[PDB]
Design a protein around this ligand. Structure first.
Ligand SMILES: [Mg+2]
Ligand SMILES: [Mg+2]
Ligand SMILES: [Mg+2]
Ligand SMILES: [Mg+2]
Ligand SMILES: [Mg+2]
Ligand SMILES: [Mg+2]
Ligand SMILES: [Mg+2]
Ligand SMILES: [Mg+2]
Ligand SMILES: [Mg+2]
Ligand SMILES: [Mg+2]
Ligand SMILES: [Mg+2]
Ligand SMILES: [Mg+2]
Ligand SMILES: [Mg+2]
Ligand SMILES: [Mg+2]
Ligand SMILES: [Mg+2]
Ligand SMILES: [Mg+2]
Ligand SMILES: [Mg+2]
Ligand SMILES: [Mg+2]
Ligand SMILES: [Mg+2]
Ligand SMILES: [Mg+2]
Ligand SMILES: [Mg+2]
Ligand SMILES: [Mg+2]
Ligand SMILES: [Mg+2]
Ligand SMILES: [Mg+2]
Ligand SMILES: [Mg+2]
Ligand SMILES: [Mg+2]
Ligand SMILES: [Mg+2]
Ligand SMILES: [Mg+2]
Ligand SMILES: [Mg+2]
Ligand SMILES: [Mg+2]
Ligand SMILES: [Mg+2]
Ligand SMILES: [Mg+2]
Ligand SMILES: [Mg+2]
Ligand SMILES: [Mg+2]
Ligand SMILES: [Mg+2]
Ligand SMILES: [Mg+2]
Ligand SMILES: [Mg+2]
Ligand SMILES: [Mg+2]
Ligand SMILES: [Mg+2]
Ligand SMILES: [Mg+2]
Ligand SMILES: [Mg+2]
Ligand SMILES: [Mg+2]
Ligand SMILES: [Mg+2]
Ligand SMILES: [Mg+2]
Ligand SMILES: [Mg+2]
Ligand SMILES: [Mg+2]
Ligand SMILES: [Mg+2]
Ligand SMILES: [Mg+2]
Ligand SMILES: [Mg+2]
Ligand SMILES: [Mg+2]
Ligand SMILES: [Mg+2]
Ligand SMILES: [Mg+2]
Ligand SMILES: [Mg+2]
Ligand SMILES: [Mg+2]
Ligand SMILES: [Mg+2]
Ligand SMILES: [Mg+2]
Ligand SMILES: [Mg+2]
Ligand SMILES: [Mg+2]
Ligand SMILES: [Mg+2]
Ligand SMILES: [Mg+2]
Ligand SMILES: [Mg+2]
Ligand SMILES: [Mg+2]
Ligand SMILES: [Mg+2]
Ligand SMILES: [Mg+2]
Ligand SMILES: [Mg+2]
Ligand SMILES: [Mg+2]
Ligand SMILES: [Mg+2]
Ligand SMILES: [Mg+2]
Ligand SMILES: [Mg+2]
Ligand SMILES: [Mg+2]
Ligand SMILES: [Mg+2]
Ligand SMILES: [Mg+2]
Ligand SMILES: [Mg+2]
Ligand SMILES: [Mg+2]
Ligand SMILES: [Mg+2]
Ligand SMILES: [Mg+2]
Ligand SMILES: [Mg+2]
Ligand SMILES: [Mg+2]
Ligand SMILES: [Mg+2]
Ligand SMILES: [Zn+2]
Ligand SMILES: [Zn+2]
Lengths: 86, 104, 49
RNA sequence: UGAACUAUGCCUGGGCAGGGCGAAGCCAGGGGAAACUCUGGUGGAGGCCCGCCGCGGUCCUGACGUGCAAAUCGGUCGUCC
RNA sequence: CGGGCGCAGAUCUUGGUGGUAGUAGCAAAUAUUCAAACGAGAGCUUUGAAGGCCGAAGUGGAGAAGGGUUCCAUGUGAACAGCAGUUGAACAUGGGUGAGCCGGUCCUAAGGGACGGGCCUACGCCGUUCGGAGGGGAGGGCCCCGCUCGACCGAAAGGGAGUCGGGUCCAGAUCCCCGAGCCCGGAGCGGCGGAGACGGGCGGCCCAGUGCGGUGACGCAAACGAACCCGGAGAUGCCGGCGGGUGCCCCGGGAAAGAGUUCUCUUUUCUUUGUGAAGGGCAGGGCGCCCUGGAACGGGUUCGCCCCGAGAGAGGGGCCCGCGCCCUGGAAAGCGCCGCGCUGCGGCGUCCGGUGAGCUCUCGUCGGCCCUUGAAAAUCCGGGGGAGAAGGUGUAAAUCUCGCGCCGGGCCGUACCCAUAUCCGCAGCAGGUCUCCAAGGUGAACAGCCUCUGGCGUGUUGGAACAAGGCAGAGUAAGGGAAGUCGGCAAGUCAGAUCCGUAACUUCGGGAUAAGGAUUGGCUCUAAGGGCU
RNA sequence: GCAGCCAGCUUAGAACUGUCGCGGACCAGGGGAAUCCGACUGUUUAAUUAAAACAAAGCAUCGCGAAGGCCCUCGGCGGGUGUUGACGCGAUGUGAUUUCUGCCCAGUGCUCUGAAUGUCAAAGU
RNA sequence: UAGUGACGCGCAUGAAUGGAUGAACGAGAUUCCCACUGUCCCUACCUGCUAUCUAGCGAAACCACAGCCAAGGGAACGGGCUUGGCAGAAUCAGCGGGGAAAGAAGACCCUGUUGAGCUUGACUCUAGUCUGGCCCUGUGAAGCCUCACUUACCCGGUGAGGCGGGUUCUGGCGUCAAGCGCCCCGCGGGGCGCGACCCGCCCCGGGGACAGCGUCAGGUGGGGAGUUUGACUGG
RNA sequence: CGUGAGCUGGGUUUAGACCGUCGUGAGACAGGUUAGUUUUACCCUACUGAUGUGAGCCGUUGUUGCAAUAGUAAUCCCGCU
RNA sequence: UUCUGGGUCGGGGUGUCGUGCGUGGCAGAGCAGCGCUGCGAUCCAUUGAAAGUCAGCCCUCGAUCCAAGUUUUG
RNA sequence: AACUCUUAGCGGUGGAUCACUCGGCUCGUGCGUCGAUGAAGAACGCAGCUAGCUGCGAGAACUAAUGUGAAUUGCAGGACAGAUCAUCGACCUUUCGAACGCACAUUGCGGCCCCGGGUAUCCCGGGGCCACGCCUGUCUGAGGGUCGCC
């Protein structure tokens, strides 16, 4: 019936891990992620959910290259030069 | 009487999961996955319902490894057309060409 | 299932290596601040999705 | 955001004991002046019958009803080319 | 001076704790018992014995999806596993998934989705083999020939070349070991052999030769050949009958080797008595395949049918499938028994038949059914074609010769559970969840009941009583027989099979197992229904 | 013309026999006479209603010859029917067969005219 | 008071809003009969699992405080208040009288200027659709209208393969030209033309400034949207 | 208008559906008809039974008894004479 | 708790069911071999036999064991 | 006796209160800097003993340089003890991702060039590449579209 005996027939994945956001929201038949909109070029980021925007905005990850710009900015983006040796 | 199991991942009685019972040197009855039966070619006429003769009834890609003699007969249209229709093709070609000389 | 993809098997490999309890010398390091691994999962009570 | 339940459709697969009634077709033998009929056998058709698996879920308004279960259990029962 | 300034209430919020309460409860699917071992500790672990259950639509053996280490060894017994635990799918420490021939990978199915174009203020959407100057490849050497050309994705159950046997682990296995193969790709020499290639006419000259046999079906180890075209295989539903073959089951050996019984009887009962792929040969089966020939007094023939002057019957051939038997493999290995040694070496055997309305699987054949006609593509092959290539007298070009040799086959999945405790249902939940294998007896049966192989402790606990009242056993009950009750609710009657006998009505099909009768055991016989020489 | 040999499994008949018991467990239709409704099979309210409800074949009507009918889309004269063409597609009603299906076009609605007198927009005059 | 067969001024039957009939069929509704039975007269006995007791384990609902009654009065049915009856620890198994027992801000009813589903002849709109004007929209002719023109625009076909003007005797076969002419390479080789006619401006057909697009205008429009649908009142 | 954690759901009175009347319609019927989940007590009393009970004392313990109070029960008919 | 007493067996009585196993038979529809022998449901005798019968039946007639010791009370 | 209730001591249960605060909140100020030279985000991996966090990327719990000047520390061990830390101009920076040969529930399927090896052929390994749109320019072309020359 509609309850307990129906939960036993659940053995077919609807979503899988997305290649762009790593979340388990990539709809298989639609071939579209439910969290980041992959494979669309633009990420879905709606303003009617500040918490959803808070979990995946810039600063919630590593910022492997943006944190270096912050350190390079405070020195004027100095390049090509080296400190004076001993 | 011992009950035997499949030897592959496929567990459904599909057309590819066809087996036969084989007795091993260890006195065991095991499943031996059979190849699908092949068909000898049909005549290119489209009339004679029987298959051609002198040709192996194997799978298509098995015909690649067979020699040419095992895939046709030594007749003109042998291996593609039956002997009955080749005689009809020769007599029809001859008699029609003769009627086209009478009109000249 | 025995039929796995490389991404799923690589995902299960990471979760299998994180399901290890904390080293005993960690409690002597942080001053018994981390008493146990609060991210220990069991294969029955909590699934991976 | 969802058709992993379910509704319908599509594609490619899988599955459904043993019996019963026994239709066209066919065979042979009788009856008749002929038209033609009669009998036996054969044959094995069917959204046919009984019925197991399966799929369903009638009644007991049984069990249970802070349950095994946020719908289950037992007997009975519907269907089962 | 400034307030987030005073709580008993808001079915207030959060957290904590009571009475109820040592209470309800730990009651679905028959079952446990004795002894021993380890241990501080045993109804629950282990071992043995006993007695039982699942009874092959398993409580058995293996998968798919899903789980993701749950697998395996060892240790622990805190917590959890609703009693316990020396146990665990718990915890702790280690270990474990080995592939050219298993699958993915390749193909397109439904479908998805780019491209051109169009649309849309736009993110984008529409559309899907159409629609663009959509070809990037040539042969021939700077020249002429190529779209039926629409990307790509989409099946671990479709299509798709080729791996099987024995052994091995604490857990791996068609992957490891040993042995025997196979497929595909690769080779300016592709490494040899064979084929092409056998000789003629003139007296050195000259001329041949891209094989050959059979009336035929067609056969030979090979047996040149492009563009282009044609065709085949892939690639065809469901149902019924019949036949061939394996597997299983059954019967006879007064067959061998162990074992059970042996109070009595039983030349007895039980178990074991085998051979892979690939290749060769031969049974067996199939054929609207051929030749001779000619049919009515029509004949052949099936369970049914069907077949025949468009050529039967008969005779002689041909082809296909041969998963059957023999052989190579290969008995050296595997099983069975016996013997010796030790803390691995030997011996013997592995035999001969009978059958079947037997059950499955498979290969066939003949039909039935459809206002239902029951896939595509990759890939592979045959033919037509004769454009070309080859040498001038012994060879050359060419070779589809499992004739032989040489080299390579990457990547990913692979343990285990797969369900009355590894999945889903909050759980070790009586629910749900796709398949494969399947014995003996009874019987029509894959029914119920019993047993073997295998599995198991009765399903989250034991002990003692046997009150009421429950639930179930569809327990039984004198006399009456629906007077009960809204109501024959409930379960009671009937039931299988054989032989008889079956109305009203009817759309002539039915109604129908109508209704109503008789029979049914055991034992000892009789009769009939076959095959073979 | 059969003799020999081999091979089962069913069927019928008879004697004898036990407590008249014997499909001994198991398995396993109570029956008859009528009414109503739906023809039948099938389907349905997962978790209170399996039915007389739905569907159904049959019957009948309606629309439409493709610059079309019906319908989809924000939009492309894009898309479905349609790989279709009236024995088709689309929209309804009734509901097997049999037997019939009367009367009413005033009302409402649909439809057909335009010897169409009225009412009558924007634009144009 | 049921069932069946009749009777029919039938509150309010009736003919594809189908009428009547009807074999077969039905886990459909109903009546009767036989058989059958614990349905009953009228209950009894037996078994298993429970309840019970025990070892271990161990909840929940619920709870203002609580818990013996009668009358009285009271918010008109007390448990407490009044007047009486009275009244003795701590408990077990039952039981279902009471606690107007629990479960649930009654679902009936009314109220609210709270909704929603749905329907029309409600109010107000709307997609679509019909129609007219303008717009793409030009050209020629005849009497605003009709007929022509093709190039706009539209449709169809095709691998855009023969447009305009000057092979039916069989279920074969047909593939880059034989042939001829001309010309160039050093008897081998190559090109060109004819074969296969010329010219042309649109690939071939079917429509055609009409379809259709854009934009206003009128009609239609419960298909859809939004909203409303008084009050008083012995409910 | 005793009595549904006593039962039974036949009726009424959800959602399915049919007929008639009514309404353009959705629907209505105080008309008929058919199918339609009846949950929980282990708490406190009451009652039913079953243990036990005057925590102070030369009382403990046993037998045989007394008894307040409470319950209370029999009923109707026929035949002969 | 030893003058004894209490259990467990056995015996008898009682009642239930219905004539046990074995053996024998010149009983047995028969049938198969050489009157003999084998097979043969049932039948007869032994045999109102056998079986079980207080655990909540009755009576001991015998046999063989057993005697302890929880808590508490003026 | 027990049981029940009250009172206090003590012990539990429980967590309030109070004190604490490397946190939040608010205001103000200065800056105001991402990305095809591969961003944000994600995945995976990296430590002697390392699960998470955090920091890094196969040079992976950090390299070089500069500043600093003796530690890091849980346990070691070992410092070429200039330890460590900070700064951070050099260098490095896996895979997915706008993600870019085609794709992806696939570590799937291709193509080109070059290099090395087995030996041009093939096989193996490595390196560099092959998305879409568009701009300037080059190159190669197309159309009697408009002409010129014949
Ligand atoms: Mg954005
Ligand atoms: Mg789970
Ligand atoms: Mg479906
Ligand atoms: Mg039935
Ligand atoms: Mg069934
Ligand atoms: Mg079932
Ligand atoms: Mg049921
Ligand atoms: Mg019913
Ligand atoms: Mg009933
Ligand atoms: Mg019930
Ligand atoms: Mg209950
Ligand atoms: Mg406040
Ligand atoms: Mg408070
Ligand atoms: Mg491990
Ligand atoms: Mg426990
Ligand atoms: Mg242990
Ligand atoms: Mg284990
Ligand atoms: Mg673990
Ligand atoms: Mg693919
Ligand atoms: Mg496959
Ligand atoms: Mg197929
Ligand atoms: Mg294994
Ligand atoms: Mg040679
Ligand atoms: Mg040739
Ligand atoms: Mg067949
Ligand atoms: Mg050829
Ligand atoms: Mg495995
Ligand atoms: Mg379960
Ligand atoms: Mg869940
Ligand atoms: Mg059997
Ligand atoms: Mg089966
Ligand atoms: Mg059976
Ligand atoms: Mg147990
Ligand atoms: Mg269990
Ligand atoms: Mg009882
Ligand atoms: Mg009962
Ligand atoms: Mg009974
Ligand atoms: Mg009785
Ligand atoms: Mg009555
Ligand atoms: Mg009565
Ligand atoms: Mg009944
Ligand atoms: Mg009848
Ligand atoms: Mg009538
Ligand atoms: Mg019906
Ligand atoms: Mg009818
Ligand atoms: Mg039906
Ligand atoms: Mg329901
Ligand atoms: Mg039904
Ligand atoms: Mg109806
Ligand atoms: Mg009709
Ligand atoms: Mg109508
Ligand atoms: Mg009218
Ligand atoms: Mg009556
Ligand atoms: Mg009447
Ligand atoms: Mg009427
Ligand atoms: Mg009418
Ligand atoms: Mg009517
Ligand atoms: Mg029914
Ligand atoms: Mg009260
Ligand atoms: Mg309350
Ligand atoms: Mg309220
Ligand atoms: Mg008001
Ligand atoms: Mg409203
Ligand atoms: Mg609503
Ligand atoms: Mg409205
Ligand atoms: Mg009012
Ligand atoms: Mg009253
Ligand atoms: Mg009342
Ligand atoms: Mg009550
Ligand atoms: Mg009730
Ligand atoms: Mg009542
Ligand atoms: Mg009712
Ligand atoms: Mg109703
Ligand atoms: Mg009713
Ligand atoms: Mg019902
Ligand atoms: Mg006694
Ligand atoms: Mg006080
Ligand atoms: Mg305290
Ligand atoms: Mg990057
Ligand atoms: Zn994503
Ligand atoms: Zn032919």
């Amino acid at each position: 019936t509609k309850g307990t005996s129906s939960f036993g027939k659940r053995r077919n994945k609807t979503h899988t891990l997305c290649r762009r956001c790593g979340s388990k929201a990539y709809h298989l038949q639609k071939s579209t992620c439910g969290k980041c909109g992959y494979p669309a070029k633009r990420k879905r980021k709606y303003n009617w959910s500040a918490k959803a925007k808070r979990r995946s905005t810039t600063g919630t990850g590593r910022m492997r290259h943006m944190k270096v710009v912050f350190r390079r900015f405070r020195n004027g983006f100095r390049e090509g030069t080296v400190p004076k040796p001993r | 009487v011992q009950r035997l199991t499949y030897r592959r991942r496929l567990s459904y009685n599909t057309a590819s999961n066809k087996t036969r019972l084989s007795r091993t040197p260890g006195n065991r009855i095991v499943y031996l996955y059979t190849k699908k039966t092949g068909k000898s070619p049909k005549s290119a006429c489209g009339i004679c319902p029987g298959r051609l003769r002198g040709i192996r009834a194997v799978r298509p890609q098995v015909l690649m490894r067979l020699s040419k003699t095992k895939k046709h007969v030594s007749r003109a249209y042998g291996g593609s057309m039956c002997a009955k229709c080749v005689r009809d093709r020769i007599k029809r070609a001859f008699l029609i060409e003769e009627q086209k000389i009478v009109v000249k | 299932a025995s039929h796995k993809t490389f991404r799923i098997k690589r995902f299960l490999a990471k979760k299998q290596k994180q399901n290890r309890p904390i080293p005993q010398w960690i409690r002597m390091k942080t001053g018994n601040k981390i008493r146990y691994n609060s991210k220990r999962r069991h294969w029955r009570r909590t699934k991976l999705g």
